[PDB]
Ligand binder design. Structure first.
Ligand code: HPA
Ligand code: HPA
Lengths: 339, 339
DNA sequence: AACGAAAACGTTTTCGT
DNA sequence: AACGAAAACGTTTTCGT
């Protein structure tokens, strides 16, 4: 149970056991053996809390999430966790559900648990969270889902959501569309307002006016896609193409369409965003803007592990790049030939 | 940084600080105050590794998963994590991907981290994993995804996958079907062979022979649904209804159908399984057997927290119940009127 | 009454022999 | 050369004053 019971059992010191265990200093084979053997019978497991107490690090990462069911997220997390395992780190997942208090509760639980660093995916960053985040300015952390830098006490990865919004609108335009609608995720999120403006840029360049009857708020969830679609597709005057700010919501956009009779992309075209793992299987296969999610995760881990190991101190920010992925949900629009 | 710097700062003992911090014994207000105040300026955070070292428990749960992207799973995990937070527990997620070694690596990392208990979702349990699981027979754990009890050193929750398979076939039968096909998940999994046999029971009762050209192995992933469907729907002689052992795979079953021209449920009917969170949004809305997933998670946590707290020792097993959920992907079959 | 002294948890590492 | 003695990490708790 203890390094003692083991040392004793092996007729050696604990200092010796600790040396064989951690291969920290030369040790006679027979000794080594003897130690292992005792470790076996004893059925010993080194307490990492004991060693952590001494060594000052826990070899563990704290993930202050929002939620982990949402495909998007689920995908990043599984990414993060993989780089944790690759590099010995243990992962502690905290879905704060956009709840300040819960955020408070996790950040603390984390700090007490003394995580080597913090990976931040809160979606929304109002001042009180920004505020709270700074107390923990001491523990090394990277905020993986924001716009710019409202930080200076942090590491960040930027997703270029604007340039994705815009990639989306452009394609719709390059396909013949001009009566386009949009359902954005929450405007308090980067992946919300960010994508939206990207897209909106595109329209103004195209001089395409976007009627408010055609912009309906989503929340990244299926029911919001459904409701939003249904709302745009039920205008007396409806668009020819829709930009849905998140695939999952998009999926719920397809559901409405079909249920309302309209064919996609024959009746309406739909371009989504994220390129979730199973969008290729949406019906019809979803055309969307893809987010390098695996790389969003690893670039975060790796960006954090650095501050930790190399004890780096100057705030960093690495960009990642969204790319269009043409599937089967967008059809040429009316202006395709006039260009 | 330390209880010392704090105690000092407050002009009190550490024993006193520890008492105010943990509300463990009466303490003069002014003292209390003084302590907090020092805790504030000091910007103090109690090390839970220190306290864990002393108190003998980490107030943390180890989740030996398989994967966490898969909706099914993703859903349970988010469940587990919620009950962890409800009850103070910290969660450590370990996706072992059905990799023994990785399993070895996580189980150890976990034990060393000294988790208060283990939540087990490995999907597949070959002997070498069963074997490995027993060494850890000392730490309190519940295996949440298996058939019966190949355990005796554990707590378990059973999902009645058989009775779900069978619920599925029955409905298909009660709808007029007799040329039915099936795509099961991996036969080394409960949710695989279990559901399958449930369903197969149903057929034998109905005297419905199920042609092997109609049973195609899935792996719970979209591409397997797709491929499996495509394979069944391309028989010179095809079925009228299909039972797809997992919703995600089902989703890929719809994709093939559509892409092959066939309408669902007009051309083929499809009943899935799991009732993932967004199946209501599949197109068309997926008819499926639902797994109480949130309750599968909580019943697991709660079942574990017991062995921990109440230090219970006699192996338990609590059943959970799958229920049919009629959506819009199944249509009456040819025998509907003759019954 | 209200609080402290110091032993203790399970290890790592620095002197040493 | 090969290994041990004992200080130390940051707390909790049991005697005590
Ligand atoms: O906040 C989000 N939630 C879910 N999916 C998403 N894709 C981009 N942003 C999000
Ligand atoms: O192993 C599984 N994986 C994914 N979804 C599932 N639904 C039941 N079993 C499974």
């Amino acid at each position: 149970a203890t390094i003692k019971d083991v040392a004793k059992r092996a007729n050696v010191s604990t200092t010796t056991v600790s040396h064989v265990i951690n291969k920290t200093r030369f040790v006679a084979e027979e000794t080594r053996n003897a130690v292992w053997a005792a470790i076996k019978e004893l059925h010993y497991s080194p307490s990492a809390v004991a060693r952590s107490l001494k060594v000052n690090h826990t070899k563990s990462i704290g993930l202050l999430a929002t939620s982990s069911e949402a495909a998007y997220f689920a995908e990043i997390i599984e990414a993060v966790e993989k780089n944790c395992f690759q590099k010995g780190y243990t992962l502690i997942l905290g879905n704060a559900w956009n709840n300040l208090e819960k955020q408070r509760a996790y950040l603390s639980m984390m700090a007490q648990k003394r995580v080597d660093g913090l990976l931040v995916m809160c979606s929304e960053y109002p001042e009180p969270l920004l505020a709270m985040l700074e107390e923990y300015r001491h523990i090394p952390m990277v905020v993986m889902d924001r716009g710019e830098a409202k930080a200076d006490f942090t590491d960040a990865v930027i997703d270029n959501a604007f340039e994705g919004g815009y990639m989306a609108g452009r394609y719709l335009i390059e396909r013949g569309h001009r009566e386009i609608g949009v359902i954005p995720g929450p405007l308090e999120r980067n992946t919300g307002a960010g994508r939206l403006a990207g897209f909106m840029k595109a329209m103004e360049e195209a001089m395409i006016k976007v009627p408010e009857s055609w912009i309906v708020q989503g929340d990244f969830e299926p029911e919001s896609g459904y409701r939003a679609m249904q709302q745009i597709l039920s205008q007396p005057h409806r668009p020819t193409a829709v930009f849905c700010g998140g695939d999952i919501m998009a999926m719920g956009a397809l559901c409405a369409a079909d249920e309302m009779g309209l064919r996609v992309p024959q009746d309406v075209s739909l371009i989504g965003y994220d390129n979730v793992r199973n969008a290729r299987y949406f019906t019809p296969a979803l055309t969307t803007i893809h987010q390098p999610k695996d790389s969003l995760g690893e670039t975060a881990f790796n960006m954090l592990l650095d501050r930790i190991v190399n004890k780096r101190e100057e705030p960093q920010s690495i960009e990642v790049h969204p790319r269009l992925i043409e599937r089967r949900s967008v059809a040429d629009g009316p202006f395709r030939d006039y260009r």
